[PDB]
Amino acid sequence: SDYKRAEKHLSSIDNKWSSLVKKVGPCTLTPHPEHAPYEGIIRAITSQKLSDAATNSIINKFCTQCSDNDEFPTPKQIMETDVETLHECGFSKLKSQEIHIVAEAALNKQIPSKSEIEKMSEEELMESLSKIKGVKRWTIEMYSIFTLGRLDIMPADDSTLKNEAKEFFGLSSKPQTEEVEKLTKPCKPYRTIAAWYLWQIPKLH
């Protein structure tokens, strides 16, 4: 598998990478490529500046409030929900508005199809999805990693990743995005897995 290859590739870089992979164990990153783009994008938007626990509670309230079935709400279902009802699920007002925008775009077929997104390079995904209000570099990276299942995404702009890179690379302060990109270059073409390993560091304590 690519995970097995990624684990061996990372371990091959140097002793610290080898040790990190051994401490954390096999990669268990589980993306959900079965999700429609509007769903993956809404999930990523919700996660901005929020813990996974908070994001989870919000999406769960969202499903119960807007779905006929407690499944992920459809674009039509989202459109039929007023902003304040969305807001009481725990989205910020601004995210609530952006989620309506995503739904309307999906409903109007203004989002690229799932089929075309699955053919796009990271660069094309960035160009295509960043037009959506509330969706910029980080959100697209998270969509690419946790929905699409892309293997070579380095979300070097992610604050948590920078903090773990600080620890792993033995830095005395928080690295800039561009510094993280340089430091993780040898991890190509499995930078998503590299990022996942760094992200597991707090669980080692």
Add this chain to the structure above:
DNA sequence: GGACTACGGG
């Protein structure tokens, strides 16, 4: 009880 913990807005 809290401190603070990507993105658009003004």
Add this chain to the structure above:
DNA sequence: CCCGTTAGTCC
């Protein structure tokens, strides 16, 4: 890199 937001956890 002016300013404020959503929630839950664990400092």
